[PDB]
Amino acid sequence: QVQLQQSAAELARPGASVKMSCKASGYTFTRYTMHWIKQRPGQGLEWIGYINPSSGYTEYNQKFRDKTTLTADKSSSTAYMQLSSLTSEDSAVYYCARGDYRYGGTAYWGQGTLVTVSAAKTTAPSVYPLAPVCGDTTGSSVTLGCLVKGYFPEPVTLTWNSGSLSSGVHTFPAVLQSDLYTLSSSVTVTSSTWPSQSITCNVAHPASSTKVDKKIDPAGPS
Amino acid sequence: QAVVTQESALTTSPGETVTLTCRSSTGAVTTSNYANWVQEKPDHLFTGLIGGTNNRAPGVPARFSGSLIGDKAALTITGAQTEDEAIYFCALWYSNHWVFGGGTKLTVLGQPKSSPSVTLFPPSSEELETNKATLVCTITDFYPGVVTVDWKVDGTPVTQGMETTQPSKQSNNKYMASSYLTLTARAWERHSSYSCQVTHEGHTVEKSLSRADCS
């Protein structure tokens, strides 16, 4: 059946180029066009352009025409998109989608190829314990945290007590802050459990081969 | 160029019918705009639903139907299901290019609405030793999955050095988000009160600390 398989995520420096691919299957490639679409968070969706591989004819949204090249190899049922002179603005997820005049649109989309444009170097995160500075009065429970600051690239993986403690966990998506990634996780336990029992945040950053196992200790006596 | 506009969010319940609409800034939507609708589900899974105004994509359930309703294009979901909780985008064709609307976030309640649980963490002394301070405001168990976040330092709105995650779905199918305020240690030591305020369904839940007190 109909599938559009996009190439893997790319990391690129400002000023460089990338070229991604979109392998089509489950249909006669020459009977359809290939559309491309950009997505940035809360920027919504932008139409890039399309190619008709049977002729090689292309059409671009004027905004993308200068730095974007759509090509296709009919013989391998694969469409390509080349982004040049990359800036932070080009950090996004890009989709290919099959255009069909009978349908009047794009019925099938690829899974997306993430492009990160960054001058950052590989950096292990700093891991900070987040204890309460104040006891919670109505609180029978307690919420502890772990701040994972200033790493590159993604991902990190975070567990508590080496996986042992997985109930009441919320591990959040990373944000970009001063050109490095930050995330956090919280775990909620009953107040009788901590600090009588140790709770450790275990962070692994495969890129840098670094693991950090930070014990959450309470603040000093008040 | 042309601007395409959709409702920003809609809430429905399993078994009900919902109508999403799509407006062209230039005038009426007509079949010459070949309105498309596409669905976005978590982890950037996009499924085409409708093309050419009313053509249903193969393998899409019949409860999805596209039409014109006077001067707008519309998607009607008859007997909405919990798995229809997703973002819906319309796209209009303008002679030689497609333009997308902003998307509608559809909630299909699989449980009652839930207000957010907010926790504000202060900077660790470990982090302060580096001359940097990060406040962390975690925000869990809210439904529908949309919130806005406002910070205040000594009562005044703070815009700079603030970053917030997009909401994401928890395993209990409510949603979570986190927000960060980043200051220097000197800026942290310079002010006393810090507030993270989360607005959900037009109601505000707030969490505060003073660096002087447990008030």
Author numbering:
A (entry chain A): 1 to 222
B (entry chain B): 1 to 215
Paper text:
C60– STI conjugate for the binding sites of the antibody. All these effects confirm the specific nature of the immune interaction. FabC60 was ~ 80 times lower than that of the full-size antibody. C60 (Kd is about 10-7 M).
crystals of the free form of FabC60. these FabC60 molecules is 1.0 Å. atoms of the variable domain, RMSD was 0.4 Å. domain of the light chain (VL) includes residues 1–108. light chains are seen on electron density maps. disordered and are not visible on electron density maps. Tyr34 (L1), Trp93 (L3), and Trp98 (L3). carboxyl group of Ser222 forming hydrogen bonds with Thr33 and His35. the antigen-binding site of the symmetry-related FabC60. residues Tyr50 (H2), Tyr101 (H3), and Trp93 (L3).
